[PDB]
Amino acid sequence: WTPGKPNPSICKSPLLVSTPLGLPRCLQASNVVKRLQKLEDIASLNDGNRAAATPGYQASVDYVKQTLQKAGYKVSVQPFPFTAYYPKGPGSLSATVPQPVTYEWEKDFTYLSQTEAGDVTAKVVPVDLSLGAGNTSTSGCEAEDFANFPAGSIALIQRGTCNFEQKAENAAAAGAAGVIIFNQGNTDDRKGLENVTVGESYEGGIPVIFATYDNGVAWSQTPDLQLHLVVDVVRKKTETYNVVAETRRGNPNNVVMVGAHLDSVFEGPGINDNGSGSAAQLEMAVLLAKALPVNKVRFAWWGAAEAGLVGSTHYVQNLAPEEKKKIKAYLNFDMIGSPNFGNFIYDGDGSDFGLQGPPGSAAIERLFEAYFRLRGQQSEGTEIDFRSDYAEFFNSGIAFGGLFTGAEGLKTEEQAQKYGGTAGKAYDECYHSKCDGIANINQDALEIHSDAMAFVTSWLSLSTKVVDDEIAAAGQIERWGHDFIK
Ligand code: NA
Ligand SMILES: [Zn+2]
Ligand SMILES: [Zn+2]
Ligand SMILES: [Zn+2]
């Protein structure tokens, strides 16, 4: 294996590692890479993944817990029940009456993530539609929408206003056999397919699929229409875990919290996504055992993020109000080793994309911006509309920030000039795939972003004054993780 050099002598000074000048120098990329190799090995021993409710995830939990305990931490493994969702094969959709049509998988229609399986054929009944440009559909949002609905029918429901889960559960309570949700069509951009979910909490029991706007319109204009609908999936009630630890030292009423989800997708080992955030954060926690922070630092490794941020969301929701209020800031680290990386910082002040985090998120962003500038490196903004485990912290008004090296987006010519790599190719062409292994890590990306992680965590562990100032001066959700919830 490739050893790094021994840590410079400043790394045993409890003073120097308590500062944003010492902590990053002590966080060596070579040491993070060895933790990434261990997670790669854990994946190889457990069918090639570290997904929620697998032995690969359990062995990941064991490794994080053991490492933390070796550093003196008391570790809290926090279990929670969790309904897993497994897509088995492609879906089927065809009209039988008044004429036979076969519709095209992943062009005409697609699954709602977290749907139940099903094989049904029934009359299709449109429910409270509002077609046409500029509409503000509330189709299926209210129980009264279904006063007309004849049980056993397939509900044809238009996207709009409320969550897909709400639409589908209302349809179920009215005795629908299945649900077809079609894109709203209120603008010419909302007429295709989308990545959409009915959520891990879905209790409707019937299958739910998504379709194009012009399909839903045509089906709504077909009297006596019957569709043959097949969804090939499985859902199972299981258990997974978050791993939480915090420093003994530090003010427990002004907690700086850092998080990184520990699960992979089922399709691969998840080494960049998100072994990289998990491993870098673990190395930092080990170093911070020696520090003398002013503010307590809490570390979290989240379960089941790939199922829609289930672990992180559950942790925040379960805090008593007095406990929630002790968390001054949350820092999220999800994918920081992308092979074709850019240097992306969460756009906390909304300067790039128009969405602002809770007060104090702008100051956290400015600290990340400062570190990259300090190092002679470029950086730029990335979106913060509830795509990662900061989402419930965001929803709760807690200041947050984070770093990102890029996923399925394509690198521009300008970004290639700023960061190197290849313009025209994804930041991580192996995102959510089998090839997201140890070989998929860019160690340059991983080093600068771990250093930047250490810098801002250290800073806030000494003083949250920049967050506190923005909080004093200050005195909808379409996405939740990978998919849209409405
Ligand atoms: Na309605
Ligand atoms: Zn991730
Ligand atoms: Zn992911
Ligand atoms: Zn910004």
Automatic annotation (TrEMBL):
Keywords, sorted A to Z: Aminopeptidase, Hydrolase, Metal-binding, Protease, Signal, Zinc
Organism of origin is Pseudomonas aeruginosa
User: Which family does the record assign?
Assistant: Belongs to the peptidase M28 family. M28A subfamily.
GO biological process terms held by the UniProt record: proteolysis
Task: Name a GO molecular-function annotation.
Answer: metalloexopeptidase activity
Boundaries of every PA domain copy: 120-218
User: What is the protein named?
Assistant: Keratinase KP1
Q: Which residues form the Peptidase M28 domain?
A: 242-454
Cited InterPro entries? M28_fam, M28_SGAP-like, PA_dom_sf, PA_domain, Peptidase_M28
Query: Can the keyword tRNA processing be found in this entry's annotation?
Result: no
Entry keyword annotation includes Flavoprotein: no
